[PDB]
Amino acid sequence: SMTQSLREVIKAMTKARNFERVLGKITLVSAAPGKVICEMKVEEEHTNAIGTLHGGLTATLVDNISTMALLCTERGAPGVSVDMNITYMSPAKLGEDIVITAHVLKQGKTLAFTSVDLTNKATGKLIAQGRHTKHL
Amino acid sequence: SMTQSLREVIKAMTKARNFERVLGKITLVSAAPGKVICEMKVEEEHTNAIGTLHGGLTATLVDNISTMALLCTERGAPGVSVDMNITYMSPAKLGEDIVITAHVLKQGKTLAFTSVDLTNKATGKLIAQGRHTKHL
Amino acid sequence: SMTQSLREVIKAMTKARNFERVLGKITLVSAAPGKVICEMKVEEEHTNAIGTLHGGLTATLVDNISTMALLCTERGAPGVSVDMNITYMSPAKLGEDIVITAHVLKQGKTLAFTSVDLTNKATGKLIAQGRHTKHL
Amino acid sequence: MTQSLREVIKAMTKARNFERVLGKITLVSAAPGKVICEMKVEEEHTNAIGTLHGGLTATLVDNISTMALLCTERGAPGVSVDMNITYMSPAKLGEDIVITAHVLKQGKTLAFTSVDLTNKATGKLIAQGRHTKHL
């Protein structure tokens, strides 16, 4: 139900023309209260000058999937970005399968906080970690 | 040729297939040692669900133009992202002209640090500010 | 051994003249590879002007306890700060017992990344969360 | 305004809470949304290797950032939401540092600050922090 709702949201992105189109290749794995797990295969359209996952796209995945985890919350408010931090620990090479897990850490009347981990699906090793503060 | 090189990098993005394709609409204003200034007009392809500049694209702009500022130094190495923080203070609306100003704060043997400001060209008011730590 | 060694390191803090003296009240709960848990009861010396745990002390707790986790590693290199980001979600009040948990997220040849959570011991509620990048 | 804020700092020298760690700072100037303080590095400010402790730099960013906020029309201190600090070069023992805070933007409920520590003699950046407070 909630999962189906989100899957529809992700389905829409594909055909969309705004910046959300960039997440067209992601696939939904799970959706639970305040926790969303997506997956994606790195393709050329996802790479930087040197052939690995572009930090800007990692940032984009942190931003949107974080909002998704927020949507799967009781209040369901998406919110507006305030601050975002991203630590890059290991490159994600072309053809690599990545797992994106978003956690709503806490949310109050006006502020929501989330944490997103990207990991190498095959190794479980951390690729990057983002923290997102949103204004509700 | 500092200015000409960046001139070439931009033209490339216009037809690139990787993620940098999303920046093809940016134009170079000036290149100097440790400081690059680009401009861009927010259009539908750069917006979020609510019609304003997408936070992930702002992160993408910070990442790349920050890298351009480092290409304009005696070492000229782009480096790999280690950390990126972004503060969103005011939205950029569709049709709005934005200025992306990037400058090198400090670069050592293996670590370089940059700061990048997006501003409304008209008002000069701050849109977002990002700090970038890169490994060389 | 890892625990005995850490207990000393902490004991030396109760007599220190440098900034580490500010943590003389923390106690060691457990030490494990890449993971250190400490506790501390909030006293006046730990509070800001309004009577809650000072944001600067939280930041100091993150820096040092993150360093202890890094010591409980094969390389055992403490490292020097490069980046730190802290998100404050709920106040820690005077008299409150807090738990400081630190995890080594990843460590390379020259860069180490940690995560440190402060939580209310009684309710397990998250107080603040820090991400630490260190140069080795 | 400067003289006023100067009193707030005199307290820290006497206070028993965590603000006491800032007793050695001195005020240079205070203006709307901008405060400049200075501090000589001494043993009480150092880490295990003998340089300015990262946690104190964090405390300095937090507090002085707040000062700039108190110097605005609204004058509200706000409570911390997020803080980020990039450490670029060590502040050595005996070294004189300058802490410069600027209020970047402030709305109805959220305020944004930026604080630079620099070496007074060389003007070299020691560390830079951004602070997001909830008003």
Curated annotation (Swiss-Prot), chain D:
Domain of life, source organism: Eukaryota
Main location: cytoplasm
Protein's name in the database: Acyl-coenzyme A thioesterase 13
Role of this protein: Catalyzes the hydrolysis of acyl-CoAs into free fatty acids and coenzyme A (CoASH), regulating their respective intracellular levels. Has acyl-CoA thioesterase activity towards medium (C12) and long-chain (C18) fatty acyl-CoA substrates. Can also hydrolyze 3-hydroxyphenylacetyl-CoA and 3,4-dihydroxyphenylacetyl-CoA (in vitro). May play a role in controlling adaptive thermogenesis.
Family in the record: Belongs to the thioesterase PaaI family.
Binding site for substrate: N47, G78
Modified residues (N6-acetyllysine): K24, K34, K40, K105, K124
Binding site for CoA: 43, 80, 87-92, 105-110, 134
Pfam families named in the record: 4HBT
PANTHER family: ACYL-COENZYME A THIOESTERASE 13, THIOESTERASE SUPERFAMILY MEMBER-RELATED
GO CC entries: cytosol; mitochondrial matrix; mitochondrion; nucleus; spindle
GO BP: lipid metabolic process; negative regulation of cold-induced thermogenesis; protein homotetramerization
Oligomeric form and interacting partners: Homotetramer. Interacts with PCTP.
One GO MF term attached to the UniProt entry: metal ion binding
Catalytic activity: a fatty acyl-CoA + H2O = a fatty acid + CoA + H(+); decanoyl-CoA + H2O = decanoate + CoA + H(+); octanoyl-CoA + H2O = octanoate + CoA + H(+); butanoyl-CoA + H2O = butanoate + CoA + H(+)
Subcellular localization: Cytoplasm, Cytosol; Mitochondrion; Nucleus; Cytoplasm, Cytoskeleton, Spindle
